[PDB]
Design a protein around this nucleic acid. Structure first.
Ligand code: K
Ligand code: K
Ligand code: K
Ligand code: MG
Ligand code: MG
Ligand code: MG
Ligand code: MG
Ligand code: MG
Ligand code: MG
Ligand code: MG
Ligand code: MG
Ligand code: MG
Ligand code: MG
Ligand code: MG
Ligand code: MG
Ligand code: MG
Ligand code: MG
Ligand code: MG
Ligand code: MG
Ligand code: MG
Ligand code: MG
Ligand code: MG
Ligand code: MG
Ligand code: MG
Ligand code: MG
Ligand code: MG
Ligand code: MG
Ligand code: MG
Ligand code: MG
Lengths: 120, 319, 102, 74, 158, 341
RNA sequence: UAGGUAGUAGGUUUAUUAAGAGUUAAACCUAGCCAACGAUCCAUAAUCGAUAAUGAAAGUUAGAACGAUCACGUUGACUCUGAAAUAUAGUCAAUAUCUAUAAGAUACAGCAGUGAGGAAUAUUGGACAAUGAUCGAAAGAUUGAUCCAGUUACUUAUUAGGAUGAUAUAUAAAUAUAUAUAUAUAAAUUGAUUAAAAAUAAAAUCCAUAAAUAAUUAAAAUAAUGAUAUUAAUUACCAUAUAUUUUUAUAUGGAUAUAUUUUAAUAGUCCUGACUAAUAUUUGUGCCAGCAGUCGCGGUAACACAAAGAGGGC
């Protein structure tokens, strides 16, 4: 990632149980220093599904809390997301395939579920 | 003034006399053998009036004060038996008048020293089926069944949940003979609930007592000014108490008024799932300034009040 | 994933272990010139077979490259300057210019 | 009452009470001094720790051993 | 600690939220009127009174507030490509897509912020008027004479 | 947890959350907590000693102090003023230990799924307890209103049932049972009339507490209540048991035993594979402790229970089951409020 | 520490700066400015929080840990570059050390580690798998940041076994179901001779789980890459089908000889005259030895010293 204003993960939690803040931060500041803004949170550990649920067809869900509107503003002013943050934003539908790279480009992989925006 | 006091029985018992040097007995142990009576070859205490369970829906709770420590009775005639000089058990010289007319409340009081603890009433297997069939089939509301049988709404909802578990168990032949034997024995040990009996009916007007109201505010008003519950509620800045009771009756899953839709206003996105991916991303809209882990929050891990929780799998996890 | 097919430059596992380099030709006996073993064994199996941390990760990176038609040519690890690391270069250079050129 | 004059590592010279029955403290012995005065001895405001440095624990102490540097008998 | 009570028992802090619009906009009429309003003088006044010389080398008046025109901000910051250039190249196409998305995002941010600010002023004005009306009604009920008032001794004439 | 030592000492006379025989005598002979002649500190100390012995003795003092909540919860009956009957004072201070009732181990004991809180902890730790379908193996798990918890049926039967006798122990009871049966067949045959006369008189004093009379009426229908010499003749003498011969061989032993009540199985071992006394019978001295909680709804057929609410105090009653009166709990509350100062 | 100040207080002008100002330099004027509501001087100290401790609270304390800010990188000054540096740069000097003896290099307040000081604070560990950072078009390279592990009860939390249990023999005709089983005989640890206990304590009995063993195996991470790691967890011959909140249950394919891995449980420490919870007594010592937070204890019946028994805390 380049630029002075970057969107990246700041690590929180305990040893062996990492959690992350999605933050807009100055490139030169420490990873866990108070950033410019905290856009959201990322819990990397998927929620465990029970034996029955697995056969039932439930897929483990990773939970992200994100301010969609504020995130779009920072992309607009030239903030540069990190590679992991880029993957998250492409899955949320904020960023598009223009931010994909040659190594992760899923040009040919079947889609089992299409992005669905709901209210809850 | 205080000193160590061996817990000798408050009632009179036969203390130890001269003892052969190798008995090494204690006055507490001999007092217990007198309470228990003789032990048969099968390891039972048939002479003790508490050895066997009641089978008439009347709890057999200890009444040491009323029987003055006389716990022995004939195993079949249930007639008092007391220790005599010969070392044998026989009829008492004078009948105990304190054991023939016992108050109704005391019969349900398990602990002599605590009259504020009483056993609950067991619901008959019929009332449970009736409640189950009314909420599920007839479609009555928990508020109606609660006001009909005099049972609190949470208890009504629990009966429906438990009877459903008994149907699945009876539908798969999982209730064994031993379970049936145990259930019946325990049923015949407790007083059965009678919806008609007014005293047995549970109070249905109870509300949690808030903390702001727990204080005592007093107002000096004109001598003939009316002041009522609604006026008091305005003074205490709380909803009327009747409203609280009504809102607490619409909480049951089968109760009327149960509603939950004002929260379905949070934008959620479910990320695209591709073949080979082991997990799906779920995004929930949040607001900057509320979302995120705060910086410089108090670490409580090394403090006695460290937060401990449980995950979906039941495993202990630090919060 | 799936088993790629041998090519002309990389006919067998031994040729594969020689092109990638980084002293990976010393594992020719671990694989036994079995093409399928190279493209089926994951890190857990390689760790049980005595491959050290650095080599097994490097092999798996080159196996992924081969599966995707990307070059597997050896890339060398970085090395410090002849005159030493930056933090010890001023001292080293001063002592190397007073013992070579005086 | 057995006492001892001690020069602390900070240069302060103090008078420390030696607790317990019997002690092997001599001149030049390394001792560790803690707070606590001897009430009946005026000017003795400190205690030496039994079982630390060159001062051994009380010989044959059975009760309150931790207060007299006595290890647990097997 | 005890200090957390003042902030809803929230432990730790967040960075101060930045303002998308760093100055008032040209559509916030209410603010524009306030600055134009004549500055008071006297005990609670602000500024140099007529005839009072201001310090030599200093500006007598305060610098004029800079109001942002969101239309002009959008035109200068995220201006559109003047020509429909031929993006046949793979990298040119990616750059075109990224530029389009960034422009869409920042234009929506500036117009949503201005709308929010204007909508917030209207809501406050409506809320205040309601509160004022409710206060008058409440006070009127308090001043309403009840029958119990007959039992309160009075000396109105004196 | 705190190690369990001398929990059932008769000299100390502390009452525990258990159905143990020794714990019943301590409760029987206690006769209340003595608070007379004691200073305020001595009264508080005594109250603490007794209450903690019963309410969560396994918890360390320092842990309990953190768990202890100064806030107690009561309920207000909004119809009391609309009744007219003499109102009763709410025992607020009997809620001092209510915070413990939501623990899973305590909930099991109150549901009578375990014979003591100590046993409840072991049931949870050994993987026999589920809450809302999920196996919970931490005794300190806190239940919320509406939660359902279940215990494996075999564990609940082993806790509420009699102890399984060992083969050797149960083989000596059968030997004595055969000897005392051959004595009843020798007295019935030598003088049948007197035995039957005594038998009829015993059935008059049954009081209906003894269901044996109901069963006996059936037997009189299986053969006016007039004597029958065929009865004495029908009676047969069982064969003696040589403990040595059938020692270590249970199938042999359970084929040489055939009594009118116990047929082809050793005493208490009708099914030696089950973990309790077979046929299943209630544990001794179960009646004094069998208390139905007001805050749980129990289904004993399935060994399921629902946590309805946290125990609350109401006029004239506290749902917190305690063997001690309000004055004792008041002193205990005073002690913990100030951390024992 | 009672007087302090002399660019000191103010005015005017120029230089310098992106920029005000005795901010610096230069010139010329006015006689001011601070101060017993504490000036000037001296000493001490990194500061603070939605952090920690304590209290009913106002507050008080800390400033390790988390986070914010400042200052410094052996010491002093100066200069260069730059938007910004008296830079952990350069220059000169000071102190110390070193080797190559040069107008030389180094300065561990980066990590690990050593000596010293001290009552007292750890590995000369693993990995770039994760999150970041730098370089590169990319492939990738680097990273003592960081992530893990090690050491250390320094702190917190969980677990660290439940039910039953006061003796043993002999004993008893020769299935309408008995039943308060009853007799003898021996044995019975410390204390004590009864409200003097130790003690349901022990052993024994019943039933478990952990660990082990076997199989299985997530998740941290995916396009791929896992240091941690001999992963957590689960299952108890493995697989499969059906029914089956959970869960349960049946039946099946392969697997061993009708049954199917094994199986536990050794806490310390202080105290018992009053404050202050500790009644079951006893021995030694004799104002000695010693105890002691306070009052005090000890001179031959010591509830206080040193112990045994018993007891109270944690
Ligand atoms: K001063
Ligand atoms: K890395
Ligand atoms: K102890
Ligand atoms: Mg006392
Ligand atoms: Mg100056
Ligand atoms: Mg000037
Ligand atoms: Mg000048
Ligand atoms: Mg300093
Ligand atoms: Mg402070
Ligand atoms: Mg300070
Ligand atoms: Mg530090
Ligand atoms: Mg510096
Ligand atoms: Mg310096
Ligand atoms: Mg320098
Ligand atoms: Mg240094
Ligand atoms: Mg270091
Ligand atoms: Mg030292
Ligand atoms: Mg330390
Ligand atoms: Mg070391
Ligand atoms: Mg390294
Ligand atoms: Mg003796
Ligand atoms: Mg295991
Ligand atoms: Mg990598
Ligand atoms: Mg993997
Ligand atoms: Mg002592
Ligand atoms: Mg003496
Ligand atoms: Mg003392
Ligand atoms: Mg003593
Ligand atoms: Mg002792």
């Amino acid at each position: 990632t380049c630029g002075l204003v970057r969107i990246r993960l700041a690590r929180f939690g305990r040893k062996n149980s990492p959690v992350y803040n999605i933050v807009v931060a100055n490139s030169r500041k420490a990873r866990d220093a108070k950033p410019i803004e905290v856009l959201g949170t990322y819990v990397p550990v998927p929620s465990p599904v029970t034996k029955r649920e697995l056969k039932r067809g439930v897929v483990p869900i990773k939970d992200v809390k994100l301010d969609f509107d504020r995130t779009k503003y920072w992309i607009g002013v030239g903030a540069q997301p990190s590679e992991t943050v880029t993957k998250l934003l492409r899955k949320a539908g904020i960023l598009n395939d223009a931010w994909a790279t040659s190594k992760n480009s899923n040009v040919n992989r079947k889609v089992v579920f299409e992005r669905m925006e709901t209210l809850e | 003034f205080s000193r160590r006091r061996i817990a000798y029985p408050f009632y009179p018992f036969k203390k130890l006399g001269r003892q052969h040097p190798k008995k090494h007995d204690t006055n507490l142990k001999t007092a217990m053998r007198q309470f228990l009576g003789p032990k048969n070859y099968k390891g039972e205490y048939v002479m003790n009036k508490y050895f066997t369970v009641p089978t008439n829906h009347v709890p057999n709770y200890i009444k040491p004060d009323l029987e003055r420590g006389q716990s022995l009775e004939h195993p079949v005639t249930k007639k008092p038996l007391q220790l005599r000089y010969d070392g044998t058990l026989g009829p008492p010289p004078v009948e105990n008048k304190r054991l023939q007319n016992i108050f109704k409340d005391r019969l349900l009081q398990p602990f002599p020293s605590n009259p504020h603890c009483k056993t609950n009433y067991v619901l008959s297997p019929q009332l449970k089926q009736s409640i189950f069939e009314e909420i599920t089939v007839e479609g009555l509301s928990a508020q109606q069944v609660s006001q009909k049988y005099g049972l609190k709404i949470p208890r009504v909802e629990a009966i429906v949940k438990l009877v459903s578990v008994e149907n699945s168990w009876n539908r798969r032949n999982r209730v064994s003979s031993d379970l049936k034997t145990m259930d019946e024995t325990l049923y015949r040990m407790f007083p059965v609930f009678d919806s008609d009996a007014s005293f047995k009916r549970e109070n249905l007007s109870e509300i949690p007592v808030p903390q702001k109201t727990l204080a005592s505010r007093f107002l000096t008003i004109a001598e003939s000014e009316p002041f009522g519950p609604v006026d008091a509620a305005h003074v205490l800045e709380l909803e009327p108490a009747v409203e609280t009771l009504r809102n607490l009756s619409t909480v049951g899953e089968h109760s009327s008024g149960h509603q939950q839709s004002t929260n379905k206003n949070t934008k959620v996105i479910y990320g695209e799932l591709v073949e080979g991916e082991r997990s799906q991303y779920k995004f929930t809209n949040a607001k900057v300034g509320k979302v995120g882990y705060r910086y410089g929050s108090g670490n409580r891990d090394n403090k006695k009040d460290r937060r401990i929780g449980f995950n979906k799998l039941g495993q202990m996890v630090y919060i | 994933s799936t088993i790629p097919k041998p090519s002309d430059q990389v006919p067998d596992v031994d040729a594969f272990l020689n092109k990638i380099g980084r002293n990976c030709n010393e594992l020719k006996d671990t694989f036994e010139n079995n093409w399928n073993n190279l493209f089926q064994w994951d890190s857990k199996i390689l760790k049980e077979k005595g491959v050290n941390i650095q080599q097994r990760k490097y092999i798996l990176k080159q196996v992924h490259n081969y599966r995707n038609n990307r070059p597997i040519h050896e890339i060398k690890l970085g090395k410090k300057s002849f005159f030493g690391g930056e933090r010890k270069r001023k001292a080293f250079t001063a002592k190397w210019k007073a013992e070579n050129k005086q | 009452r057995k006492a001892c004059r001690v020069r602390l590592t900070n240069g302060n010279v103090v008078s420390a009470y030696i607790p317990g029955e019997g002690h092997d403290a001599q001149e030049h012995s390394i001792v560790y001094v803690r707070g606590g005065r001897c009430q009946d001895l005026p000017g003795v405001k400190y205690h030496v720790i039994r079982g630390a440095g060159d001062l051994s624990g009380v010989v044959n102490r059975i009760s309150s051993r931790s207060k007299y540097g006595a290890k647990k008998p097997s | 600690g005890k200090g957390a009570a003042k902030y809803g028992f929230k432990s730790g802090v967040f960075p101060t939220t930045r303002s998308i619009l760093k100055s008032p906009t040209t559509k916030q009429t209410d603010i524009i009127n306030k600055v134009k309003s004549p500055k008071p003088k006297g005990v609670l006044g602000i500024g140099y009174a007529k005839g009072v010389k201001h310090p030599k080398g200093s500006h007598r008046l305060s610098p004029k507030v800079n109001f942002i025109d969101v239309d002009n901000l959008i035109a200068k910051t995220v201006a559109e490509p003047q020509s429909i250039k031929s993006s046949n190249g793979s990298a040119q196409k990616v750059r075109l897509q990224k530029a389009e998305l960034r422009r869409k995002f920042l234009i929506e941010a500036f117009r949503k912020e201005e709308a929010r600010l204007l909508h917030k002023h209207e809501y406050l004005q409506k809320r205040t008027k309601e509160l004022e009306k409710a206060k008058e009604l409440e006070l009127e009920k308090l001043n309403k004479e009840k029958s119990s008032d007959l039992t309160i001794m009075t000396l109105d004439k004196m | 947890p705190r190690k369990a030592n001398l929990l059932k000492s008769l000299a100390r006379g502390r009452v525990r959350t258990s159905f143990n025989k020794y714990n019943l005598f301590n409760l029987y002979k206690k006769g209340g907590v003595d608070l007379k002649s004691k200073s305020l500190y001595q009264q508080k100390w005594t109250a603490k000693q007794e209450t903690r012995a019963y309410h969560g003795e396994h918890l360390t003092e320092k842990r309990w102090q953190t768990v202890f909540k100064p806030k107690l919860d009561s309920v207000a009956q909004l119809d009391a003023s609309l009744r007219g009957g003499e109102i009763k004072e709410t025992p607020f201070l009997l809620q001092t230990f209510a915070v413990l009732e939501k623990r899973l181990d305590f909930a099991l004991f109150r549901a009578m799924f375990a014979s003591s809180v100590r046993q409840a902890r072991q049931f949870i730790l050994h993987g026999n307890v589920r809450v809302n379908g999920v196996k919970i193996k931490h005794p300190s798990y806190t239940l919320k209103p509406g939660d359902m918890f279940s215990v494996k049926p075999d564990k609940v039967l082993e806790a509420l049932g009699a102890k399984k006798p060992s083969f050797q122990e149960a083989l000596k009871i059968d030997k004595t049972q055969i000897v005392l049966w051959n004595k009843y067949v020798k007295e019935a045959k030598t003088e049948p009339k007197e035995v039957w006369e005594k038998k009829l008189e015993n059935f008059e004093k049954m009081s209906d507490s003894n269901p044996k009379k109901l069963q006996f009426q059936e037997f009189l229908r299986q053969y006016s209540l007039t004597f029958d010499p065929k009865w004495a003749k029908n009676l047969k003498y069982h064969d003696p048991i040589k403990l040595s011969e059938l020692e270590g061989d249970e199938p042999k032993a359970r084929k040489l035993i055939n009594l009118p009540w116990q047929k082809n199985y050793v005493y208490g071992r009708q099914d030696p594979k089950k973990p309790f006394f077979t046929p299943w019978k209630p544990r001794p001295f179960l009646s004094p402790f069998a208390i139905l909680p007001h805050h749980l709804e129990i289904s004993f057929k399935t060994c399921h229970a629902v946590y309805l609410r946290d125990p609350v105090a109401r006029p004239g009653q506290s749902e917190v089951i305690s063997p001690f009166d309000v004055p004792v709990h008041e002193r205990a509350y005073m002690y913990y409020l100030r951390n024992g100062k």
